Design a protein around this ligand. Structure first.
Ligand SMILES: [K+]
Lengths: 10, 274, 100
């Protein structure tokens, strides 16, 4: 299964 | 033995040709199990291995959500990154993400990964400790400071040490017959004379799993690396791999040379002779 | 910017035996960017209905793909593969040899 959070902008 | 789960994301900006193309692929060792393509009709994470097909819609719903959330973040980041390197709207650019975890034979965490790349070159990477970041350039340093303030490393470590290894456990159990298999290579040898005094001796290894193999040439027992040609371990297309090793030998001396095949699926290494 | 030439490999799924059903494979790797044109050829003509693997990459960010089609080899028919990328000035054609 994939990573949900973080997902923060560069 | 030791296993790994890995995810590979690719975001490619297409100026004028609409919105960026996002492709996500998931692997358990050398087996691709999931896919996502922003160009496909489904607009869902799709199964690519039989053992993942047993997952219910709540799995596919969550995986689709995660992957679309990253595709959207990449869409904005593509813009941010071209402002960083001061690039025009005109050009096409690439963002690549690699992440995953390795487990021991006990099924416990060994090491985690997360690394990003902009236009093929290393951008930002999570360090072995999963607590600090490594910025490859001046632009990446801005991302590093942003990610430090947002405590991105804690959230990444929480996944890599936690959820990542837990999914791998679930996958290894549900796909034991496939993932824990050791397919041995189907070995054969070919001889092709190049000159009246020279000949090519090629050794084959077909239909093996995992991809890890060692092909070596030997002359009367002594190791041979001089005049040896090797091909990159290639996929067969059925979930197995192929590889060949060739050597240029003097005509009539073909019986002196032996090929040694080393694979996990072999009880003892094979010795092939013409 | 990173520009890497694709490495081409044309081969079959199983060892080539005339009249028997097989798969013609084309493995493009080590390339950057992802934008690539890969076609499978039967006597210089483009084979229709050629499927491919999902875009993936190496530890050094170099992409790789497997293009494949179900085929039945014959002594008469010549199979090859046409590949084009930004690093290539013109489409590169790699002929299929039964022992490579
Ligand atoms: K070109």
């Amino acid at each position: 299964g994939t990573s949900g959070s973080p997902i923060i902008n560069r | 033995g030791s296993h790994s789960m890995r995810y590979f994301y690719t975001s490619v900006s297409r100026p004028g040709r609409g919105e960026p193309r996002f492709i996500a692929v998931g692997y358990v060792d050398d087996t691709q199990f999931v896919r996502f393509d922003s160009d496909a009709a489904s607009q869902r994470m799709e199964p690519r291995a039989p053992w993942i097909e047993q997952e219910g819609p709540e799995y596919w719903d969550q995986e689709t959500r995660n992957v679309k959330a990253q595709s959207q973040t990449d869409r904005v980041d593509l813009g941010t990154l071209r402002g960083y390197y001061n690039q025009s709207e005109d050009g096409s650019h690439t963002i690549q993400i690699m992440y995953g975890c390795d487990v021991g034979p006990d099924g416990r965490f060994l090491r985690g990964y997360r690394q990003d790349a902009y236009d093929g070159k290393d951008y930002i990477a999570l360090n072995e400790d999963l607590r600090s970041w490594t910025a490859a350039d001046m632009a990446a340093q801005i991302t590093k400071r942003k990610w430090e303030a947002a405590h991105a490393a804690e959230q990444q470590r929480a996944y890599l040490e936690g959820r990542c290894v837990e999914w791998l456990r679930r996958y290894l159990e549900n796909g034991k017959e496939t993932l824990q298999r050791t397919d041995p290579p189907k070995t054969h040898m070919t001889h092709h004379p190049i000159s009246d005094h020279e000949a090519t001796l090629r050794c084959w290894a077909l239909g093996f799993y995992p991809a890890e193999i060692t092909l070596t040439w030997q002359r009367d027992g002594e190791d041979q690396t001089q005049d040896t040609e090797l091909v990159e371990t290639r996929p067969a297309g059925d979930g197995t791999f192929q590889k060949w090793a060739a050597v240029v030998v003097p005509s009539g001396e073909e019986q002196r040379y032996t090929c040694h095949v080393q694979h996990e699926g072999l009880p003892k290494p094979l010795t092939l002779r013409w | 910017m990173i520009q890497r030439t694709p490495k081409i490999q044309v081969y079959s799924r199983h060892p080539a035996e005339n009249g028997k059903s097989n798969f013609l494979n084309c493995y493009v790797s080590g390339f950057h960017p992802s934008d690539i044109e890969v076609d499978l050829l039967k006597n210089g003509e483009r084979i229709e209905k050629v499927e491919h693997s999902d875009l993936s990459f190496s530890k050094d960010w170099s992409f790789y793909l497997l293009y494949y089609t179900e085929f039945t080899p014959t002594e008469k028919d010549e199979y090859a593969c046409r590949v084009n990328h930004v690093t290539l000035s013109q489409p590169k054609i790699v002929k299929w040899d039964r022992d490579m």
